[PDB]
Design a protein around this ligand. Structure first.
Ligand SMILES: [Mg+2]
Ligand SMILES: [Mg+2]
Ligand SMILES: [Mg+2]
Ligand SMILES: [Mg+2]
Ligand SMILES: [Mg+2]
Ligand SMILES: [Mg+2]
Ligand SMILES: [Mg+2]
Ligand SMILES: [Mg+2]
Ligand SMILES: [Mg+2]
Ligand SMILES: [Mg+2]
Ligand SMILES: [Mg+2]
Ligand SMILES: [Mg+2]
Ligand SMILES: [Mg+2]
Ligand SMILES: [Mg+2]
Ligand SMILES: [Zn+2]
Lengths: 119, 116, 60, 178, 124
RNA sequence: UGCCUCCUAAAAUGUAACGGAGGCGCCCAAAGGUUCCCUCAACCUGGACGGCAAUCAGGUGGCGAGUGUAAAUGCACAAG
RNA sequence: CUUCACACAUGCUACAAUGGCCGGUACAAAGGGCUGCGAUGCCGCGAGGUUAAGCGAAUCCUUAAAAGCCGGUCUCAGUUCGGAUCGGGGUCUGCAACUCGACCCCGUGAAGUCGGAGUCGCUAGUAAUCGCAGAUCAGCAACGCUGCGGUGAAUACGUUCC
């Protein structure tokens, strides 16, 4: 099954960087989750496991943005950059989710370095 | 130039070039090259593909060549063995079968000398 | 790696001695492959001792 | 646009639903990869496989193959670990369906005294494997400019679940069984 | 020196060989035929075409007029000093071999380290 | 006769005997650093030369492989 | 009486171009033949089959001698060299061809690339090589033996050594 191989071999990569990158209340963790249709993002604070901010490409503001899928990744990166600053967060660690850093996930992070977050 | 799966060697006269097919000697190679219209003193590198169609059908309809001749010879030897004839016992041991002399000779059905 | 390591693989016209022809993609220079047997002119694609006694002698 | 792929989803794809009662259209078998390797065991001596098994499979299949090293050492075969002993290509997609056409149509009846391929050669899952003779049958290599003759074996890997389900698929592609 | 297979009657035939790179001519109307089981010494001063004479026999050059004929029993043995030669950072064991254990010196199997040690390169 | 590892050693450490087993006086310019990716052995079915076993394809397989080098403690999240 | 892990002896055919093959074409001698020799004609790829003239023979048959000559082809190769072995299909003789006959046809196309120490024949129409006939005999293992002619050489200082 080519779909069971993809899920098993992406929670293995996501655990590979989880040994070294945790995220606290002063420096939260920007988890990304990429599908074929959307991308999801959340700041998780792994000392009690409690999300403080979230954004996604399923709410109606991201949905009506023209362009390709990279253009809708810039918009979700700007949103969590101005939802974290409304919760007192300016420095974060970036979590790849297990994916290759490039393309849509590289455009999420580069959109969130121009709008307040400081990694 | 492949004819039956035999790969006729280049620069060789066509009366001799057909003799490298298993099942065609010098006599058959005259009557292959008399039915078609190919003269004998023709080099095999000048062999037109329109000519080679004329001897891929006269051979496969009138002669017996590689594979289905070689599977007859090792089946005719195979017939003599399990019926238990004299030539079958004489084909098992590798001794000559047509009443040859086996006292001072028959070095072809046997190997070289053993020298006890 | 998918940039001029592999040999040229361009469109190719095949013909047979039967007269059958079709069109695929191959590495033959010129794209003019000519065969002498194909899948529509080959055999298998389309299809005792007592009797050998009787022709030589006859019935008793 | 290959002619065997468009023939697959024209009548082969429909004929497999009548013969086997599949509920959903995603259950219909389809060949996925065709794996071709030489297996040059006499490369542990004389070190000639660069012109040997690379400059001919690239002519046959289309792309440059993978020189495979060896896992463990064997004293009876006179090789050690990490020695180039096999050469393999993998065909996917459009170059696959252009290879199964060019195999069955022009190539495969150039086996000397060819009588067919045995349909008992399934692994038990629906995958097929047959061998060949030499650098004959494929026209893209020439009989003159080659080295010693060397054969191969060709894997055909299908998505089918059982053997006769995969036998019905490869029957309609044009494989001669007996 | 390893012995090769049995050699026939025609070794090299040369019939009216001409070779030249410019208006200068090196070989002009040369006809000879190399013998069997002998040693042929080639004599000449510098820049006269001794090494170009070998490169027409091995086929790395091309005759201008006339032909070279080899013969079906002849298997040659020749390596230029300039086209590949040696590689300055591969070790002397992996120049004779190519990283392999046993090598073919002509229809026989000998070890590569037992082959370079027959040519003086022994030990480490 | 110095140095490393285990049992003797009596559940922290330590502990003797001309008690019981082995190693070391190196090697590596990557077999060091870092980023990224991958999972092994064995077994079973199919396959040109190909055999118990080379390379290939598919099942099964949670550590039984592997670790530059003895042995213990470790390592599959890998330190492979 | 012909067996066959082997050993010796006398031969024949070879390893090729002073040759193979294909087409043409010239020259013998000595012999045999009525329980036989079978001309010619026809049929058969061929061994042969059938019809039957002539002859107890300087008459008729056996009888086309082959090397040679001329022309073509192959181009130094385990090959158009070599023709062993084996498969299939036939003829003849004989009551009968399995052990065990020769011949023919088609296919297969083995060793062999001039031979270790040692050894043999020959001094002229000889040696080398090429055919033909006879005796025994239903046929024949006839490459043997006894004969016949064709073409046709090289050397012999000399008597120390064997
Ligand atoms: Mg303790
Ligand atoms: Mg204690
Ligand atoms: Mg010690
Ligand atoms: Mg590294
Ligand atoms: Mg590692
Ligand atoms: Mg006797
Ligand atoms: Mg002959
Ligand atoms: Mg003649
Ligand atoms: Mg006639
Ligand atoms: Mg002549
Ligand atoms: Mg010769
Ligand atoms: Mg030999
Ligand atoms: Mg005298
Ligand atoms: Mg007689
Ligand atoms: Zn056709």
């Amino acid at each position: 099954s080519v779909s069971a191989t993809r899920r098993i071999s992406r929670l293995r990569r996501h655990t590979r960087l989880r040994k070294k990158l945790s995220g606290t209340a002063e420096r939260p963790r920007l988890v990304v989750h990429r599908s074929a249709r959307h991308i999801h993002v959340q700041l998780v604070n792994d000392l009690n496991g409690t999300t403080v901010a979230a954004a996604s490409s399923i709410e109606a503001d991201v949905r009506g943005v023209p362009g390709d899928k990279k253009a809708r990744s810039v918009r979700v990166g700007q949103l969590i950059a101005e939802r974290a600053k409304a919760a007192g967060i300016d420095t974060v660690v970036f979590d790849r989710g297990g994916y290759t850093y490039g393309g849509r996930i590289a455009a999420l992070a580069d959109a969130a370095r121009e709008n307040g977050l400081s990694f | 130039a492949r004819l039956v799966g035999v790969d006729l060697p280049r620069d060789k006269r066509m009366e001799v070039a057909l003799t490298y097919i298993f099942g065609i000697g010098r006599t058959r190679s005259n009557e292959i090259l008399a039915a078609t219209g190919i003269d004998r003193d023709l080099r095999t590198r000048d062999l037109t593909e329109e000519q080679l169609i004329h001897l891929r059908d006269y051979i496969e309809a009138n002669l017996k060549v590689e594979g289905d001749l070689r599977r007859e010879v090792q089946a005719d030897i195979r017939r003599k063995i399990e019926i238990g004839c004299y030539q079958g016992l004489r084909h098992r041991r590798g001794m000559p079968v047509r009443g040859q002399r086996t006292k001072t000779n028959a070095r072809t059905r046997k190997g070289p000398k053993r020298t006890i | 790696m998918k940039s001029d390591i592999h040999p040229a693989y361009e469109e190719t016209t095949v013909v047979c001695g039967c007269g059958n022809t079709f069109q695929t993609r191959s590495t033959k220079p010129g794209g003019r492959i000519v065969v002498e047997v194909c899948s529509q002119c080959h055999p298998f694609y389309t299809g005792g001792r007592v009797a050998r006694f009787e022709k030589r002698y006859g019935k008793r | 646009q290959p002619r065997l792929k468009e023939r697959y989803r024209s009548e082969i794809r429909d004929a497999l639903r009548k013969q086997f009662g599949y509920g959903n259209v995603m259950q219909i078998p389809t060949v996925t990869k065709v794996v071709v390797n030489m297996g040059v065991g006499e490369a542990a001596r004389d070190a000639k496989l660069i012109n040997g098994a690379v400059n001919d499979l690239a002519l046959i299949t289309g792309q440059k193959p993978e020189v495979r090293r060896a896992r463990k050492s064997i004293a009876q075969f006179k090789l050690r670990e990490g020695m180039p002993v096999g050469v393999r290509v993998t065909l996917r997609g459009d170059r696959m369906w252009e290879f199964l056409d060019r195999l069955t149509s022009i190539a495969l009846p150039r086996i000397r005294d060819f009588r067919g391929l045995s349909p008992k050669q399934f692994d038990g899952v629906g995958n097929y494997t047959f061998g060949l003779a030499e650098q004959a049958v494929f026209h893209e290599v020439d009989v003159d400019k080659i080295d010693r003759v060397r054969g191969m074996d060709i894997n055909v890997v299908t998505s089918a679940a059982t053997d006769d389900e995969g036998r019905a698929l490869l029957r309609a592609l044009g494989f001669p069984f007996k | 020196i390893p012995v090769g297979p049995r050699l026939g009657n025609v070794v090299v035939e040369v019939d009216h060989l001409d070779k030249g790179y410019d208006g200068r001519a090196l070989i002009k109307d040369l006809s000879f035929s190399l013998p069997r089981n002998g040693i042929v010494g080639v004599i000449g001063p510098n820049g006269v075409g001794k090494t170009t004479l070998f490169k027409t026999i091995v086929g790395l050059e091309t005759p201008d007029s006339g032909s070279v004929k080899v013969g079906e029993t002849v298997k040659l043995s020749y390596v230029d000093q300039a086209r590949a030669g040696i590689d300055p950072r591969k070790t002397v064991w992996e120049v004779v071999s190519d990283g392999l254990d046993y090598i073919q010196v002509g229809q026989t199997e000998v070890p590569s380290r037992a082959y370079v040690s027959a040519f003086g390169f022994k030990g480490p």
